[PDB]
């Protein structure tokens, strides 16, 4: 019948406060409305004028705050027929109260082979932190610790190469500060 619609954010999920992200869903060619919903309720909705040669919807978000993190999903409608939900989509809002220390073993400069460990610790927070990768080999790792946690890389390779950072979290989806980056040099 009607494809299911896929939303994602751009420039990505992790949304500092009082900064804008947007939210695109694709429905499919023709669709009439998109609903973007936010945790049980209506957060916005597009009419695609003329809707022919149209799939793709944007939602902005110009202002980001805690009570905009959370799970969206993103209906659409050809004719009288609503699609299935999409994927659900996580957005956090960062910038959030203090900053955390990231730290890394054996040191910033290492050769491939060599087991990297990054540590990120914050004092008044929960137990789940963040490890973040940026760049072209760019993600986001989770991890647990009381007060301290730590993100085994195992051997590195060229591919472990970029700047990290990481966070805190007050809740799952309220993270702290970015820490200071440290940048990981990969030889050979």
Not at 124 to 150: C, D, I, N, P, W
């Given at each position: 019948?009607?494809?299911?619609?896929?939303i994602?954010?751009?420039?990505?999920?992790?949304?500092?406060?009082?900064?804008?992200?947007?939210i695109?869903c694709?429905?499919?060619?023709?669709?009439?409305?998109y609903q973007l919903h936010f945790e049980g309720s209506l957060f916005a909705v597009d009419?695609?004028?003329?809707?022919?040669?149209?799939?793709?919807?944007?939602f902005y978000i110009?202002?980001?705050?805690?009570?905009m993190?959370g799970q969206y999903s993103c209906?659409?409608?050809?004719?009288?027929?609503?699609?299935?939900?999409?994927?659900?989509?996580?957005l956090?809002?960062?910038?959030?109260?203090?900053?955390?220390?990231?730290?890394?073993?054996?040191?910033?400069?290492?050769?491939?082979?060599?087991?990297?460990?990054?540590?990120?610790?914050?004092?008044?927070?929960?137990?789940?932190?963040?490890?973040?990768?940026?760049?072209?080999?760019?993600?986001?790792?989770?991890?647990?610790?009381?007060?301290?946690?730590?993100?085994?890389?195992?051997?590195?390779?060229?591919?472990?190469?970029?700047?990290?950072?990481?966070?805190?979290?007050?809740?799952?989806?309220?993270?702290?500060?970015?820490?200071?980056?440290?940048?990981?040099?990969?030889?050979?």
């Amino acid at each position: 019948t009607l494809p299911k619609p896929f939303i994602w954010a751009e420039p990505h999920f992790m949304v500092p406060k009082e900064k804008q992200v947007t939210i695109c869903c694709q429905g499919n060619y023709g669709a009439v409305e998109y609903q973007l919903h936010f945790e049980g309720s209506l957060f916005a909705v597009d009419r695609p004028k003329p809707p022919e040669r149209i799939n793709k919807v944007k939602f902005y978000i110009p202002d980001m705050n805690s009570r905009m993190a959370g799970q969206y999903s993103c209906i659409y409608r050809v004719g009288e027929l609503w699609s299935e939900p999409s994927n659900l989509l996580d957005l956090v809002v960062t910038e959030m109260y203090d900053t955390p220390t990231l730290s890394v073993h054996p040191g910033p400069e290492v050769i491939s082979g060599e087991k990297v460990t990054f540590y990120c610790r914050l004092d008044t927070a929960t137990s789940m932190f963040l490890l973040l990768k940026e760049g072209r080999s760019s993600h986001v790792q989770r991890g647990y610790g009381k007060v301290q946690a730590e993100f085994p890389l195992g051997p590195v390779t060229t591919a472990h190469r970029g700047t990290y950072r990481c966070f805190g979290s007050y809740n799952n989806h309220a993270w702290s500060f970015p820490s200071e980056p440290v940048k990981l040099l990969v030889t050979g």
